[PDB]
């Protein structure tokens, strides 16, 4: 009071010093049950994978995929993400994903990478330098390799031109290295561009088959569809907290409401376009939002000369969250009062308070 009045003495009366508000306690979020998981099980746990020059292409869009389970899985030998870090991949996402699955040798896993050249990197599959996405390679010697020779797998070895990024060649044209024409029959300068794979269960490190799946992410102007679910925590009621209900951010206290939402609305506003009701995406119930209490404070004093004790009035605040003990606390139509006792008599009004009541010095 002395600081506000900018003086060392204060006369009897009531003065308004500062304000008061209730700080939020914790933060909560809420999101729906998030269903329709992406069918990535049939890709990473497929019985058979195609060849490198006949890689299987799968489209992923309009579903939810959890990248944490695949990132934490130890069944993958190499997991390299170029566009973004794997940890942040669960949050950021693009409009579609293309999965290219094939089988290569152990030494050819490095060739399937941006800015890489080689037999596989130029004649079977090509990856762009600015490729965004991830590559997951795992050994498949125990499954793909055959003791009798898994010659079903084939790889291209000869072609006049290289391979464009994301280009698949399955042509069986007889490569003519020399200038001698061949009428469909291999000769001195003509050979078959495709060679069968000779994987064995016991062939050493490097010659073992490796299943490789490349996830290429594209962000065409269509909205993003596939990425990790949003984590949701349990709601807290009867506390002034800040919430993020399905992207709607608001600070206040949450109570149960009896409003009858028609089955397609989500949230409601009363007037002046301010939200007052909201429906939680999980329980599907109507809740009410009320801003937590605030108001000005005031000091009642009988004068610095007369005495040295004061009383405090919180205006328009229920006598439930005052903070601090002082004296008995009284609740009035104007708010809550600390530092004075209520009597039953009635005298002349000295320091007006409100609602037809006021205080005086006798104590206060």
């Amino acid at each position: 009071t002395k600081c506000t009045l900018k003086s060392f003495t204060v006369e009897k009366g009531i003065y308004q010093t500062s304000n008061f508000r209730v700080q939020p306690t914790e933060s909560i979020v809420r999101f729906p049950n998030i269903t329709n998981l992406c069918p990535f099980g049939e890709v990473f746990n497929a019985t058979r994978f195609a060849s490198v020059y006949a890689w299987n292409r799968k489209r992923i869009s309009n579903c939810v995929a959890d990248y944490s389970v695949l990132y934490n899985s130890a069944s993958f030998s190499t997991f390299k993400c170029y566009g973004v870090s794997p940890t942040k991949l669960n949050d950021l996402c693009f409009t579609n994903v293309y999965a290219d699955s094939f089988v290569i040798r152990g030494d050819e896993v490095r060739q399937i990478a941006p800015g890489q050249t080689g037999k596989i990197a130029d004649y079977n599959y090509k990856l762009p330098d600015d490729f965004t996405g991830c590559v997951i390679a795992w050994n498949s010697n125990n499954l793909d390799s055959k003791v009798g020779g898994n010659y079903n797998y084939r790889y291209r070895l000869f072609r006049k031109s290289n391979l464009k990024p994301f280009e698949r060649d399955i042509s069986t044209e007889i490569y003519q290295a020399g200038s001698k024409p061949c009428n469909g029959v291999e000769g001195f300068n003509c050979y078959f561009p495709l060679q069968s794979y000779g994987f064995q269960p016991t062939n050493g490190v490097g010659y073992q088959p490796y299943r490789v799946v490349v996830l290429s992410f594209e962000l065409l102007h269509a909205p993003a569809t596939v990425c990790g679910p949003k984590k949701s925590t349990n709601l807290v009621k009867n506390k002034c907290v800040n919430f993020n209900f399905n992207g709607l951010t608001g600070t206040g206290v949450l109570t149960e409401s009896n409003k009858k939402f028609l089955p397609f609305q989500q949230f409601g506003r009363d007037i002046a376009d301010t939200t007052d009701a909201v429906r939680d995406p999980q329980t599907l119930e109507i809740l009410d939002i009320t801003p937590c209490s605030f108001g000005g404070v005031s000091v009642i004093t009988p004068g610095t000369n007369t005495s040295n004790q004061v009383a405090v009035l919180y205006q328009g605040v229920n006598c439930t969250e005052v903070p601090s003990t002082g004296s008995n606390v009284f609740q009035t139509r104007a708010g809550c009062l600390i530092g004075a006792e209520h009597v039953n008599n009635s005298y002349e009004c000295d320091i007006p308070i409100g609602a037809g009541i006021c205080a005086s010095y006798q104590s206060i």
């Binding site: 309009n62 102007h221 269509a222 909205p223 569809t225 409003k259 009858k260 939402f261 028609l262 397609f264 609305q265 989500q266 949230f267 409601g268 506003r269 009363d270 007037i271 009701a277």
Partner: protein, 236 residues
């Protein structure tokens, strides 16, 4: 399997009054017993809507479709710009069990129709992108509103039990939102699909324009009355 019929389907292009139909919920916000003024695309009150008793019609900003349906003769809708495989085409069919929506570069015939003894009006289905399956939409009055803004396709629907003879009834009923598609297409023309058997259907078509409306929300949040602010000076 698609052939052109002999007789010309020159349905008479009559005209009639729109009255006070074609109002839909603009959003999913709940309001109770309040008057709210909003500017958006709407069908002007007492407008001139076309009656057909099936030429390709332009789509423009939005389309209001009304059907005095009997035994579900209308079955599907076609949306596109070039109506061939050079551009993406949207196809919707409400067959006996479900509704199927496809986004593909189809090759439709000159006179596509459902054919009865599922989809055979297209010769080819090349580079399909989006597919969707849901529950069936359908002496009944069927009202639909189709819009396409910012790569989003919005479908509003309403069903009504009617007993009037010829034209639209004098009443009010809001169109609740039904279907949303997050697919970006620049459709300019559309078409209707009939369940014709090899051996007369009538509907109403109206267009939408940007204007301001005043809507009244009752206690329970249902739109019960509306006012067009560009009409006679009393309305303003």
């Amino acid at each position: 399997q698609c052939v052109n019929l002999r007789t010309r389907t020159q349905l008479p292009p009559a005209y009639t009054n729109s009255f006070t139909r074609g109002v839909y919920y603009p959003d999913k916000v709940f309001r109770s017993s309040v008057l709210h003024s909003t500017q958006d695309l709407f069908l002007p009150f007492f407008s001139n809507v076309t009656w057909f008793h099936n030429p390709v019609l332009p789509f423009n900003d939005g389309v209001y479709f009304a059907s005095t349906e009997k035994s579900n003769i209308i079955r599907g809708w076609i949306f596109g710009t070039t109506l061939d495989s050079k551009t993406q085409s949207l196809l919707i069919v409400n067959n006996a069990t479900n509704v199927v929506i496809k986004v593909c570069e189809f090759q439709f015939c000159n006179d596509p129709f459902l054919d009865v003894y599922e989809s055979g009006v297209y010769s080819s289905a090349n580079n399909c992108t989006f597919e969707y399956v849901s529950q069936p939409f359908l002496k009944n009055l069927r009202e639909f509103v189709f819009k396409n803004i910012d790569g989003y396709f919005k479908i509003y629907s309403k069903h009504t039990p009617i007993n009037l003879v010829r034209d639209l009834p004098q009443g009010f009923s809001a169109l609740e939102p039904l279907v949303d598609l997050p697919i970006g297409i620049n459709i300019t023309r559309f078409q209707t699909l009939l369940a014709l058997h090899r051996s007369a259907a009538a509907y109403y078509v109206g267009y939408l324009q940007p204007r301001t409306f005043l809507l009244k929300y009752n206690e329970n949040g249902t739109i019960t009355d509306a006012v067009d602010c560009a009409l006679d000076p009393l309305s303003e």
